[PDB]
Design an enzyme around this catalytic site. Structure first.
Site, PDB file in Angstrom:
ATOM      1  N   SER A   1      -0.120  15.517 -12.196  1.00 26.61           N
ATOM      2  CA  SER A   1      -0.217  15.260 -13.594  1.00 26.61           C
ATOM      3  C   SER A   1      -0.374  16.682 -14.142  1.00 26.61           C
ATOM      4  O   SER A   1      -1.041  17.480 -13.843  1.00 26.61           O
ATOM      5  CB  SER A   1      -1.455  14.281 -13.664  1.00 26.61           C
TER       6      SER A   1
ATOM      7  N   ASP B   1       0.913  -1.110   0.089  1.00 30.97           N
ATOM      8  CA  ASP B   1      -0.058  -0.181   0.025  1.00 30.97           C
ATOM      9  C   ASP B   1       0.982   1.261  -0.040  1.00 30.97           C
ATOM     10  O   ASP B   1       1.573   1.551   1.164  1.00 30.97           O
ATOM     11  CB  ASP B   1      -0.921  -0.099   1.223  1.00 30.97           C
TER      12      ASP B   1
HETATM   13  N1  LIG Z   1     -12.614  -2.631   2.711  1.00 31.74           N
HETATM   14  C1  LIG Z   1     -11.754  -3.937   2.546  1.00 31.74           C
HETATM   15  C2  LIG Z   1     -10.893  -3.809   3.671  1.00 31.74           C
HETATM   16  N2  LIG Z   1      -9.802  -2.651   3.796  1.00 31.74           N
HETATM   17  C3  LIG Z   1      -8.789  -2.939   2.775  1.00 31.74           C
HETATM   18  O1  LIG Z   1      -8.697  -4.241   2.014  1.00 31.74           O
HETATM   19  C4  LIG Z   1      -7.939  -1.892   2.201  1.00 31.74           C
HETATM   20  C5  LIG Z   1      -6.827  -2.137   1.345  1.00 31.74           C
HETATM   21  C6  LIG Z   1      -5.857  -1.124   1.543  1.00 31.74           C
HETATM   22  C7  LIG Z   1      -6.473   0.165   2.133  1.00 31.74           C
HETATM   23  S1  LIG Z   1      -7.898  -0.616   3.186  1.00 31.74           S
END
Ligand SMILES: NCCNC(=O)c1cccs1
Ligand SMILES: NCCNC(=O)c1cccs1
Length: 330
Positions: free
Chosen positions: A199, A35
């Site tokens: 951008s 991430d």
């Molecule tokens: N809403 C599903 C649980 N949250 C996530 O999988 C996230 C991935 C990246 C930031 S939150």
């Protein structure tokens, strides 16, 4: 040193990507969501509330000979999508694709929100934004990249996400076979802790390019492309029957549509997102309304170049003393 790991979409839509990570001694392999929009490495664990674990692989620190409790340290994070997690902290040995960091903060979840529980494929997150966003208290902790940086051959990592296919995260080198043409580098602001850049504009399909500054973040942990409402309206105006649905929570379009491409500018260079990349499928099983991959950022407070955009490029996260981003076509 370098590392190289394959990243794999969690489902047929590319809702997120998982990358295997070795934690502890002997290794415990968890599949983490890398991430670039957050800065905590946290995992489902033997400490996670049992009712909040449904199919994830857990980290058990008591089974690792290198795990040490980071005494007194806690963490708690709330993401832009409404999801959250919290817990305590261990240090342990963490390896990605052959690159090892000793003494990495591994944030052990005691609690996770329902959307984490409901996603059996994601065992935690590995944050790759700047360490100034890390939530550990009272002593803030460094990211895996920040801990690795000094050891790397070059202070860089690259994201090469696949469209409906695996891709690669590399650490410490730029694979010159992985992209076409040249890499265009662009300035980064670290003032908000993100890989934030500007951008130079956009085009819709075969339309003329509009030169306009769009400040946003390169965020591998966000699925979609979130841009100003003007830009998003201009895109969906080219799709017969597309509309913004308050009930669904964004732009939807007929599943029978052929979507136009979307181009974004990186300096004088251009990255083209094919139309197919913008299709996120039926809003509910069997529906003929499909969810769009380009959505308004108006409700967020920042523009987000998420996976829809990043997967069209080879992306260099340059962690030199003055960070920069690089984009190449591929
Ligand atoms: N809403 C599903 C649980 N949250 C996530 O999988 C996230 C991935 C990246 C930031 S939150
Ligand atoms: N226009 C066809 C509807 N789109 C789909 O079925 C899918 C999108 C992503 C994976 S399948």
């Amino acid at each position: 040193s370098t590392g190289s790991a394959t990243t794999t979409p969690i489902d047929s839509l590319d809702d997120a990507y998982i990358t295997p990570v070795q934690i502890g001694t002997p290794a415990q392999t968890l599949n983490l969501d890398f991430d670039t929009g957050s800065s905590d490495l946290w995992v489902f664990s033997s400490e996670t509330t049992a009712s909040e674990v449904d199919g994830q692989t857990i980290y058990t620190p008591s089974k690792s000979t290198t795990a040490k409790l980071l005494s007194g340290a806690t963490w708690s994070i709330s993401y832009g999508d409404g999801s959250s997690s919290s817990g305590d902290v261990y240090t342990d040995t963490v390896s990605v694709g052959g690159l090892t960091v000793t003494g990495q903060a591994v944030e052990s979840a005691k609690k996770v929100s329902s959307s984490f529980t409901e996603d059996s494929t994601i065992d935690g997150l590995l944050g790759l934004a700047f360490s100034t966003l890390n939530t550990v208290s009272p002593t803030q902790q460094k990211t895996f990249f920040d801990n690795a940086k000094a050891s790397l051959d070059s202070p860089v990592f690259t994201a090469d996400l696949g469209y409906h296919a695996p891709g690669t995260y590399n650490f410490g080198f730029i694979d010159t076979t992985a992209y076409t043409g040249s890499i265009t580098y662009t300035a980064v602001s670290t003032k908000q802790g993100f890989w934030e850049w500007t951008s130079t504009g956009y085009a819709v399909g075969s339309g003329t390019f509009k030169s306009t500054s769009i400040d946003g973040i390169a965020d591998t942990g966000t699925t979609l492309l979130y841009l100003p409402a003007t830009v998003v309206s201009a895109y969906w105006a080219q799709v017969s029957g597309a509309k913004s649905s308050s009930s669904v929570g964004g732009y939807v379009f007929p599943c029978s549509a052929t979507l136009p491409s979307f181009t974004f500018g990186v300096g004088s260079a251009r990255i083209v997102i094919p139309g197919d990349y913008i299709d996120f499928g039926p809003i509910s099983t069997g529906s003929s309304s499909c969810f769009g991959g380009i959505q308004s950022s108006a409700g967020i407070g920042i523009n987000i170049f998420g996976d829809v955009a990043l997967k069209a490029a080879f992306v260099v996260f340059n962690g030199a003393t003055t960070p920069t981003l690089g984009f190449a076509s591929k």
